[PDB]
Amino acid sequence: TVGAVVVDHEGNVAAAVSSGGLALKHPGRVGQAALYGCGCWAENTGAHNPYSTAVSTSGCGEHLVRTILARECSHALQAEDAHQALLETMQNKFISSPFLASEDGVLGGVIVLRSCRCTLLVEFLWSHTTESMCVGYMSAQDGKAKTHISRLPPGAVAGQSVAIEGGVCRLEGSGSGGFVLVHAGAGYHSESKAKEYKHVCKRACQKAIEKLQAGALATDAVTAALVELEDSPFTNAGMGSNLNLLGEIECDASIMDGKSLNFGAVGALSGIKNPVSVANRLLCEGQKGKLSAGRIPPCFLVGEGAYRWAVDHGIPSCPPNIMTTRFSLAAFKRNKRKLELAERVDTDFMQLKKRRQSSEKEND
Amino acid sequence: TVGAVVVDHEGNVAAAVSSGGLALKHPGRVGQAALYGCGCWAENTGAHNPYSTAVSTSGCGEHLVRTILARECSHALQAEDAHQALLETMQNKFISSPFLASEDGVLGGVIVLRSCRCTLLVEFLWSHTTESMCVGYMSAQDGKAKTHISRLPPGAVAGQSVAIEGGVCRLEGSGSGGFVLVHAGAGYHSESKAKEYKHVCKRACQKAIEKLQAGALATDAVTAALVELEDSPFTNAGMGSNLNLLGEIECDASIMDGKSLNFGAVGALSGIKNPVSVANRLLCEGQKGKLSAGRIPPCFLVGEGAYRWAVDHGIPSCPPNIMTTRFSLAAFKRNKRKLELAERVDTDFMQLKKRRQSSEKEND
Amino acid sequence: TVGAVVVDHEGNVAAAVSSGGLALKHPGRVGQAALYGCGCWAENTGAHNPYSTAVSTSGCGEHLVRTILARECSHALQAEDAHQALLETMQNKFISSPFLASEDGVLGGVIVLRSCRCTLLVEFLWSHTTESMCVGYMSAQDGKAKTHISRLPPGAVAGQSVAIEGGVCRLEGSGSGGFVLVHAGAGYHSESKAKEYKHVCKRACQKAIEKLQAGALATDAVTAALVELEDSPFTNAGMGSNLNLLGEIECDASIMDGKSLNFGAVGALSGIKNPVSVANRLLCEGQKGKLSAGRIPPCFLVGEGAYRWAVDHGIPSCPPNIMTTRFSLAAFKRNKRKLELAERVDTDFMQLKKRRQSSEKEND
Amino acid sequence: TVGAVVVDHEGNVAAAVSSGGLALKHPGRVGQAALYGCGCWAENTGAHNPYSTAVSTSGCGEHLVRTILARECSHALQAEDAHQALLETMQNKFISSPFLASEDGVLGGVIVLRSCRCTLLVEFLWSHTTESMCVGYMSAQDGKAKTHISRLPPGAVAGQSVAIEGGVCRLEGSGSGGFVLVHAGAGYHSESKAKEYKHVCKRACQKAIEKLQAGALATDAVTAALVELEDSPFTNAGMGSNLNLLGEIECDASIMDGKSLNFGAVGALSGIKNPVSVANRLLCEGQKGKLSAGRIPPCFLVGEGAYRWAVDHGIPSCPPNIMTTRFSLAAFKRNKRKLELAERVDTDFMQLKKRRQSSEKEND
Amino acid sequence: TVGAVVVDHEGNVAAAVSSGGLALKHPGRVGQAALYGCGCWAENTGAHNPYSTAVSTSGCGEHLVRTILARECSHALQAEDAHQALLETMQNKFISSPFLASEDGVLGGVIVLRSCRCTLLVEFLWSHTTESMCVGYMSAQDGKAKTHISRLPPGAVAGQSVAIEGGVCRLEGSGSGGFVLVHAGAGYHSESKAKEYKHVCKRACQKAIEKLQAGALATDAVTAALVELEDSPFTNAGMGSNLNLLGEIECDASIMDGKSLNFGAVGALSGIKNPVSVANRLLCEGQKGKLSAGRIPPCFLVGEGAYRWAVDHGIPSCPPNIMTTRFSLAAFKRNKRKLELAERVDTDFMQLKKRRQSSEKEND
């Protein structure tokens, strides 16, 4: 589950997110990074909105459905600071919060951005309760991009404990000014694929910076970053996604502009190279749409409808094939073997609990 | 859009909602009454939750998604009362707020319910900014059901003004106790069919009460209510729903349980007689799936595969036609003719804006 | 118990109220619509006063003594909205509020007005817990006046349940701008006198609008509306009031200017056609009074003192006769018959509980 | 204006107050110490009421009506302490607030009491902005009574500056427990009579304590205290009260019970030796009147008929003369002479302002 | 600056800290880790105290004194969570606040711990704005100790950015329960000695746990931890501390107990091997001194006489030399040489600013 957040020279934030969902999910299934406040979030500075803020989420699809973590986080940041408004959503509204009270853990990861003026101040923080998570950030005058992972202290039981890093920066507020913060998602302790994730994050941020250095909108800025993220075959989002119950590929992706508070997302969208492009197009269409262009426009298209609307305006399509990769297909064969040796033992209890009622109620 | 809220003898709440979507929508378009916190809500009593609260929404199409009218209602209901912890989430957080700034009014509707103990107090209120809205309520001891319309006062410009109404009651704290509140959705001033909306509401309520008097779960209670609401041919939900650009039926339905804080929704569901039943089964399956029944189960399914899961379990399916009716199809021909005489005027202005470029830029 | 609230083109609010009190009240008895925060209220926009607000009250004289409902309501409206600051005084500080905890009900009715600038916004809401209540409103550019009643849903037990309607408007803020909201009070289910109440409200609002269109003050504006209300013989306030324990007429009336926060009220004022006129004169006298005109002036005159002060400055007087009417006198004969057949049975228990102590302590 | 507050062994509070009104007032003028929330207050411990609080006010005349110094004190006392939940209601909500903006200072006085359990803690404080004020306090176990003056510090311009004082104590949680706090009212720097105010206070306190040690109700406790305060010829309350424009006596008195939150007041009461007794009987009658004793009973009565109800029950009445005294009548002749030499100067300026019009407008 | 926090089986917290002061400080200079609310803090669970919280600070020198980073952390920790009730006291109340406005960054560090019951939840977090910081934690059941560094992310300008981290755990609610969190202080990027800081931390933790598993007081627990921290020659605290302008050792140490809210500190303590032991004995002596053991005992002692009290009780003293080491004295010669070549440049500018006055003012 990969995502990103950004702000431009004028202090206008935006946020995006993309994911392929659970390993063997049933056909046409939408998790988070698609729903309104569960996926990304973006809000620009206003009246009882002191700060201009942006969030993205990850991790279990289910856990971030149950708290609307992205809005909740986004509404907790009206407290006097950046690093002491977040985890009150991680521990007061997630870890020890009723919304996930019948689960083995509270597995997830989030990134935040905050910004205000006096000359703009930018705060970046990334929290999670999984074994590990990766991030990357950059600024316009800064010049070179940073990467690195945010793992939990040696032997700290993941789920229970939640590690969180951060920082603060100052960008000049005339023209040459933008900052990006992206994430390659949470996971298990397979260290093998570490260097890869760190690389695609560097490339991702550079692109967004290039768009912001070209004077692009924050919405287009986060799209570019999500493109390079999806395009990578190690990310479980866009190219190289998880294979479903029928070994097919079905993505979920969202995006929000805080300036205009306009939203656009897609779900179970099969056969599209960059799901985020569709979600961006849906968000731009909402602008021109309201000004004498038919009726109320759309922003949550799904699967079959997503496919038609995408090709119909002009988004190149892929056959479930390139979107598929050696790693994913190999992962699919070993993931199908777990359900083989599980559905075969779930029909052993159904014939042994009916055989304990067969020799008492039926024989005799 | 139609839907309901309920509480049982023990004070356990649940909420549901079903919708067909805005008239000529593009294929695979999931609006509200499907999304997690914008459709309906249910929250049982706890520590920072003083009351046990339940909501169901209706609106123009996407307006209630814009500010999650359901949960941003829920988190405001924890304020010391029932009837002054509602519109704060519909005026400062809907009518006059940044969420909906550049729209021709803030059309929408809502029904709420709360339950606290000392012997149980139940408070029922319904707000909206639409020309009219219909509702029905009943209790176990009450005996006979109540209906009636809740229109805006004479010559009060709909969109601008809002019209709330409510009440309070006491239920005996024994097995013989439950209260249901349904709604037949918002509309325009076409008073012919008013009689119908009221009949199905009275009848919806009875079934729910009979479920409650038989000792059924709150979740199953609102299902029987939404079932009798969907089955009605006048309700733009389940049977007699709106038709899309390709004259097809695509429903949106969701449900929530307060006790367990479990969720179940469907989107762009074509070919299923009672969409709320799919949503119910998704919620009921979530209860059993967490006791070594495979792995993380599913709560939100869409179109092509909502159908698969419905039938693989055993939900009565239909060809996407019996769901149309004399009125729906008569309406679709009329609605499509508005677009014929509109797209022929919107592609003329492009010719005219490519002929002023063609008598200035292109010619010489 | 009739009342009203208003705002002028500059956003300056005011409020008034008049009542004849309980049916057979004992000589010189003042209920509410006379006391400071129990009757009307008016406050203009300031520092920790975000909105400019006005209230009036009704119903039981006693119930609105016990909560200072008009100030309480007026101080609860500093919350971010209009329709979610009211009933937190209706249910958190009235229905389930200790101030009325030894009573059979919480019988009452209120009207509110709120106003702020960017071009002014006006919000009007009317709540109650009685079988019914009547209202009427108008604006300067609007042109024609609206009326209608706000009854409780079919069979909703009054006292327990409380129904509340509302709206929002926008008046141009140059010169031609004012809005009025008046009320004919709460009561029983005698539908016979419905049309009458609706008529006097229309006339009432027109007068206030005519004064505001003539550039009169909000104080004089609400007085004019209260004049037409009192003058009507169906209103239990001013002409056609309730007859006391000695079959005499004794009114109570108040008024407040929010701009200057100046108050003036009267109680048990016998023999005056328009009690509100006296209350207005008392409020104007407080202005000229402070600027080198003797000493601290007065604002709560009662009965015998009210009568002298009224005639002494120039208010035409009435003999308890015209103020009396066929309906009221006929009502007095049937109301005196209840106490006849009650005081005759309250002296049966006093001679039977003294006769149970006469044949034990005295015989022997 | 004089008055008191008390608590009994069980921690049940009550408050009372009696006043004669501003010197040459117009007939039938009810000021404070008569109004519901501006005179005195009593509130017993509950849910949102942590402490059990009691207040009694005194002031210039109408200044304490302006912001209901008693209840706006009460609702501030629920703040975590005793001595920093007082002046907030007397400075931001009285000295420097919109309530009293265009007045030559904010003259006034107040006495407060609170009681919470674990064994009962009692806190007593007295604030004012008048040159001087006198008080007296006692407890059951305490044994001997305390008196003394609470003047503003040397050369501190009265009106501007405020002078608070207080203390805390513990009472054994058995039958032998109660605490009384009375006051002899505000005044000017005419130190001759200081001895008197102190004597009647010591004696007022003893009676109340003897009522408390005999096991009387809190309500009856403060009555005996106010009785001995009214009976004093130096106190502008009950006997030796101020005389009005027509050299007549017109008292104002009220009382409140915290347990039942029951109220009883009188206004412009001429001819009754102890006005607080009328107020007490009105409160005592409210307790019996709610158990099928006719219908809704009365709590606030005025002048002509306060007299009727007093005597019809049996309260010792007098001709309105014995209530005057050597000092009161000597004062009335002196006070009336100020008006003779003042109205002869205020009607001269009208002649002069009708002679400049008569040598310019009228002549030619 | 080094230090620790702990909790025992019963959930009783305590905190400690020891420091040598800024390198070439003037004699008798007490900085933080000595002051009451700026050094460390301990608060046991109560009424307005929901959690039982413990803190220990480190910083540049005086920066943490500036805003009492410990108690202004403590009073913020009562917010609904652990990890979002910290930096609010380090960003709005430290990085970007008036407390530290005209300083070249806001260098500092902090470690926190909380404990609430239902079976005891313990939350441990460490924040800082320094290049690096080291920590170690352990629990009774845990078995083996954890160490590791918590540096700022690659190329994140230290001073500006802040880097938090944390976790949560559960302890069995029996005798076998306790958790320790120590720290080896902030520093610069001189990575040679990293191995050392970690070794002494692991070893510090073990001792504390062995105290906790033997059933020692929380206060005595952190003493054994600080003892093994002070004894280390690399820690600028106890042995191997910083040397002042006169090449002398002058320590600062404090401790607090949550149960009793008792305090003990020392400042400019020269010649005592473990300064935290003096602080401990001062705290332990405060417990016995309040039971008719003379009069008001002492809690904060300084230099010349901290020595007297230490030895009069029996704390192993030393000549102020064994406290120096190869590295400390090698560092003092190097540090003094910076001042030689600095005071010879700062007294040259005075000559130059007394020669421009000497070629203009003084000559003629």
**Partners of chain C (3+ Cβ pairs below 8 A):** B, D
Phi/psi at C257 (nearest 5 deg)? -100, 115
Q: What are phi and psi of C316, to 5 degrees?
A: -55, 135
Determination technique used: X-ray
Angle between helices B218-230 and B275-288 (to 10 degrees): 160
Chain B residues within 8 A of C146 when measuring between CB atoms: 153-156
Beta-bridge partners for E171: E120
| The residue to which tokens 């104007």 are assigned | C284
Report the C-alpha gap between A194 and C151 in whole angstroms.
Answer: 69
What residues in A contact B39, CB-CB < 8 Å? none
B132 phi, psi to nearest 5 deg: -150, 165
* Interacting residues of A213 by C-beta distance below 8 A, sequence separation 6+: A140, A176, A178
Would you say B276 and B39 are in contact if contact means Cβ atoms under 8 Å apart? Answer: no
C-alpha radius of gyration, chain A, whole number: 22
- Chain B residues within 8 A of A29 when measuring between CB atoms: 298, 300-302, 305
Cα torsion C240, C243, C246, C247: sign = positive
Give CA separation, B165 vs A92, B13, B84, C89, C155, in Å: 34, 21, 12, 16, 14
CA B313-B285-A64 angle, 5° bins: 130
Cβ–Cβ contacts within 10 Å for residue E318, how many?
A: 13
Question: CB distance A303–B298 less than 8 Å?
Answer: no
The residue in chain B having the minimum alpha-carbon distance to the alpha carbon of residue A298 is B29
Query: Which pairs from A50-53 meet CB under 8 Å and 24+ separation?
Result: A50/A78, A50/A116, A51/A77, A51/A78, A51/A82, A51/A114, A51/A115, A51/A116, A52/A7, A52/A11, A52/A12, A52/A13, A52/A114, A52/A115, A52/A116, A52/A258, A53/A13, A53/A77, A53/A112, A53/A113, A53/A114, A53/A115, A53/A258
Instruction: Give the containing element (helix H, strand E) for C329.
Output: helix C326-352
CB E12: neighbour CB atoms within 10 A?
23
**Which residue of chain E comes nearest to A77, CA vs CA?**
E84
Chain B interface, best mutation among C73, C74, C80, C84, by max B CB count within 10 A: C84
Cross-chain Cβ contact A342/B294 below 8 Å: yes
D183 Cα distance to chain centroid: 9
Three-class secondary structure of residue B236 per DSSP: coil
A162, E84: Cβ pair inside 8 Å?
Answer: no
Q: Name the β-bridge partners of E126.
A: E111
Q: What angle do CA E312, E302, E130 make, to 5 degrees?
A: 130
What count of other Cβ atoms lies within 10 Å of the Cβ of residue E306? 26
DSSP state of E98: G
Strands C120-128, E178-187: pairing is unpaired
Q: Helix axis angle, B303-313 relative to B275-288, nearest 10°? A: 70
Q: If you search the block for the tokens 């499907």, which residue do you land on? A: B34
Q: Where are the beta strands (DSSP E) in chain C?
A: 2-7, 13-19, 41-43, 52-59, 108-117, 120-128, 132-139, 163-171, 179-187, 251-257, 262-269, 300-302
Which one of C296, C313, C340 would you mutate to disrupt binding with D, by most D Cβ within 10 Å of its Cβ? C296
Cα D130 to Cα D32, D90, D150, D201, D252, distances in angstroms: 17, 13, 10, 19, 21
Computed from CA positions of residues D222, D228, D230, D236, in that sequence, does the dihedral angle turn out positive or negative? negative
Do B271 and B319 meet the contact criterion of CB atoms below 8 Å apart? Answer: yes
Torsion of CA C308, C312, C315, C317, to 10 degrees: 50
**At what angle are helices A275-290 and A303-313 packed, to 10 degrees?**
70
At D275, which helix (H) or strand (E)? Answer: helix D275-288
Crossing angle of helices D218-230 and D275-288, in 10° steps, is: 160
Pairing mode, strands D262-269 and D300-302:
parallel
Which strands make up the sheet holding B300-302, listed edge to edge? B132-139, B178-187, B2-8, B13-19, B251-257, B262-269, B300-302
Residues of B classed as catalytic: 1
- The DSSP bridge partners found for residue D254 are D17, D265
Mutate to test the interface with C, among B51, B67, B81, B100 (most CBs of C within 10 A): B81
Assigned token pair, D289 = 């009147």
Rounded to an integer, what distance in angstroms lies between the CA atom of residue A303 and that of residue A324?
A: 17
Residues in chain E: 364
Contact of A20 with A236, CB cutoff 8 Å: yes
Q: How far is C312 from chain D (nearest CA, A)?
A: 12
**Partner residues linked to D5 by β-bridges:** D15, D181
The single-letter code of the amino acid at A260 is: S
| Token duo for residue A284 | 């731009």
3-state secondary structure of B11: coil
Residue in this structure with the two tokens 């705060």, named with its chain if needed? A123
Q: How far apart are CA D252 and CA A169, in angstroms?
A: 67
Residues of E in contact with A86 (CB under 8 A): 83-84
Q: How far apart are CA C15 and CA B6, in angstroms?
A: 41
Q: Which residues of E touch A76 (CB under 8 A)?
A: 84
Report which DSSP code applies to E271. Answer: S
**Cβ count near E149 (within 10 Å):** 14
Cβ separation of B92 and C81 shorter than 8 Å? yes
| Cβ atoms of residues E172 and E141 within 8 Å | yes
Q: Quick check: helix, strand or coil at residue C134? A: strand
Residue ranges in chain E assigned as alpha helix (H):
63-66, 71-77, 194-214, 218-230, 275-288, 303-313, 326-346, 348-352
Contacts 24+ apart (CB under 8 A), E204-210: E204/E4, E204/E136, E204/E180, E204/E228, E204/E229, E205/E136, E205/E137, E205/E138, E205/E145, E205/E180, E206/E138, E206/E145, E208/E4, E208/E6, E208/E138, E208/E178, E208/E180, E208/E182, E209/E138, E209/E139, E209/E140, E209/E145, E209/E178, E209/E180
Which of D29, D49, D304 lies at the smallest CB-CB distance from C298?
D29
Are C59 and C90 a contacting pair, CB within 8 Å? no
Rg (CA), chain D: 22
In the 8-state DSSP scheme, what is residue C238? Answer: S
For A290, the closest of B102, B296, B300 (CB atoms) is B102
**CB under 8 Å to B56, separation ≥6 — which residues?**
B3, B4, B5, B15, B16, B17, B33, B39, B40, B70, B110, B111, B183
Which residue type is seen at B269? L
Of D27, D37, D267, the CB nearest to C37: D37
Indicate the SS3 state at residue D226. Answer: helix
Residue with tokens 């309201």: A290
- The Cα of C305 is separated from the nearest Cα of chain D by a number of Å equal to 4
> d(Cα C180, Cα C16) in Å, to the nearest integer?
12
CA B10 to chain centre: 25
Contact assignment for C304 to D304 by CB distance below 8 Å:
yes
Nearest to A88 among E84, E127, E146 (CB): E84
Question: Most A CBs within 10 Å: which of B29, B52, B278, as the mutation test of the A interface?
Answer: B29
Q: Go through C337-355 and write b for each residue having 16 or more CB atoms within 10 A of its CB, e for each that does not.
A: eeeeeeeeeeeeeeeeeee
d(CA D180, CA D169): 12
Which residue pairs from A282-289 have beta carbons closer than 8 angstroms and sit at least 24 positions apart in sequence? A282/A309, A283/A219, A283/A255, A283/A256, A283/A257, A284/A219, A285/A313, A286/A262, A287/A260, A287/A262
| DSSP letter, residue C358 | I
Q: Tell me if B92 and C86 make a contact (CB, 8 A cut-off).
A: no
The residues of E annotated as belonging to the active site are 1
SS3 sequence of D50-108: CCEEEEEEECCCCHHHHCCCCHHHHHHHCCCCCCCCCHHHCHHHHHCCHHHCCCCCCCC
Radius of gyration for the alpha carbons in chain E, expressed in angstroms and rounded = 22
Distance from CA of D10 to the nearest CA of C (A): 19
CA atoms lying within 13 Å on the CB side of residue C88: 26
Q: What is the DSSP letter of B146?
A: B
The order of strands in the sheet holding A108-117 is A41-43, A52-59, A108-117, A120-128, A163-171
Element spanning D112, H or E = strand D109-117
Structure tokens at E91: 């960003």
Sign of CA dihedral C215, C217, C218, C222: negative
Task: Give the CA count within 13 Å in the CB-facing half-sphere of E157.
Answer: 10
Residues of B in contact with A271 (CB under 8 A): none
Q: Which residues contact C306 (CB under 8 A, 6 or more apart)?
A: C266, C267, C268, C269, C272, C278, D28
**Side chain identity at residue B335, one-letter code:** N
Residue A303, Ramachandran bin (φ over 0: left; ψ between -120 and 50: alpha; else beta): left
Q: What is the DSSP letter of B261?
A: T
Ranges assigned E (strand) in B206-361: 251-257, 262-269, 300-302
Measured distance CA(A209)–CA(D346) in Å, rounded: 81
Closest among E10, E5, E6 to E175, alpha carbons compared: E10
Whether the CB-CB separation of A86 and A75 falls below 8 Å is answered with no
Q: Which of B22, B36, B103 sits opposite A35 (nearest CB)?
A: B36
E82/A87 touch (CB, cutoff 8 Å), yes or no: yes
CA distance D149 to D132: 7
Nearest Cα to Cα of residue D110 among D102, C36, D91, D260? D91
Please tell me which of the candidates D27, D35, D346 has its beta carbon nearest to residue C36: D35
Query: How many other CB atoms are there within 10 angstroms of residue E195's CB atom?
Result: 9
> CA-to-CA distance for C288 and A266, rounded, in angstroms?
70
Is C53 within 8 Å of C70 (Cβ atoms)? no
Please list every residue in chain D whose beta carbon sits closer than 8 Å to the beta carbon of residue C304.
27-28, 268, 303-304
Handedness of CA B237, B242, B244, B246 (dihedral sign): positive
For B267, the token pair is: 């989107």
CB contact under 8 A, B162 and C167: yes
How far is Cα D180 from Cα D172, in angstroms, rounded to an integer? Answer: 15
Find, among E259, E317, E257, the residue nearest to E283 by Cα: E257
What DSSP line would sit under B79-105, residue for residue?
SS-STTSSGGGTIIIIITSGGGSSSS-
Comparing alpha-carbon positions, the chain B residue that sits nearest to C158 is B167
CA-nearest of B13, B23, B25 to B54 is B13
Half-sphere exposure of C307 (CA within 13 A, CB side): 16
Q: How many CB atoms lie within 10 A of CB B15?
A: 32
Residue among D38, D261, D298 minimizing CB distance to C36: D38
Those residues whose C-beta lies under 8 Å from the C-beta of residue E48, and which sit 6 or more positions away, are: D80, E78
CA of C124: how far to CAs of B208, C14, C39, C121, in Å? Answer: 36, 14, 18, 10
Q: Could you report how far apart the first and last alpha carbons of chain E are, in Å?
A: 56
Question: Within 10 Å of residue A281's Cβ, how many Cβ atoms?
Answer: 18
Contact assessment for residue E163 and residue E206, using Cβ atoms and an 8 Å cutoff: no
Distance CA B183, CA B197 (A): 9
Range E231-235, long-range pairs (CB < 8 A, 24+ positions): E231/E273, E231/E274, E232/E196, E232/E200, E233/E325, E233/E327, E233/E328, E234/E193, E234/E196, E234/E197, E234/E200, E234/E327, E235/E2, E235/E184, E235/E185, E235/E197, E235/E200
Subunit contact D298:C26, Cβ cutoff 8 A: yes
User: Which residues from chain A sit within 8 angstroms of residue B261, using beta carbons?
Assistant: 66, 98-99, 101
Distance CA C300, CA D66 (A): 12
Cβ-based contacts of E161 with chain A (< 8 Å): 166-169
**Structure-token pair, residue B158:** 């709909």
- Token pair, residue D219, equals 């309500």
Residue E343, Cβ density class (10 Å: 0-12 exposed, 13-18 middle, ≥19 buried): exposed
Integer Cα distance of B275 and A267 in angstroms: 19
CA distance B196 to B147: 11
Cα separation, D256 vs C244, in Å, equals 26
Which amino acid is it at E155? Answer: G
Query: What are phi and psi for residue C170, nearest 5 degrees?
Result: -135, 115
Q: In angstroms, rounded to a whole number, what is the distance separating the alpha carbons of residues C26 and B168?
A: 35
- Give me the count of residues in chain B: 364
Under 8 Å CB pairs connecting chains A and E tally to: 130
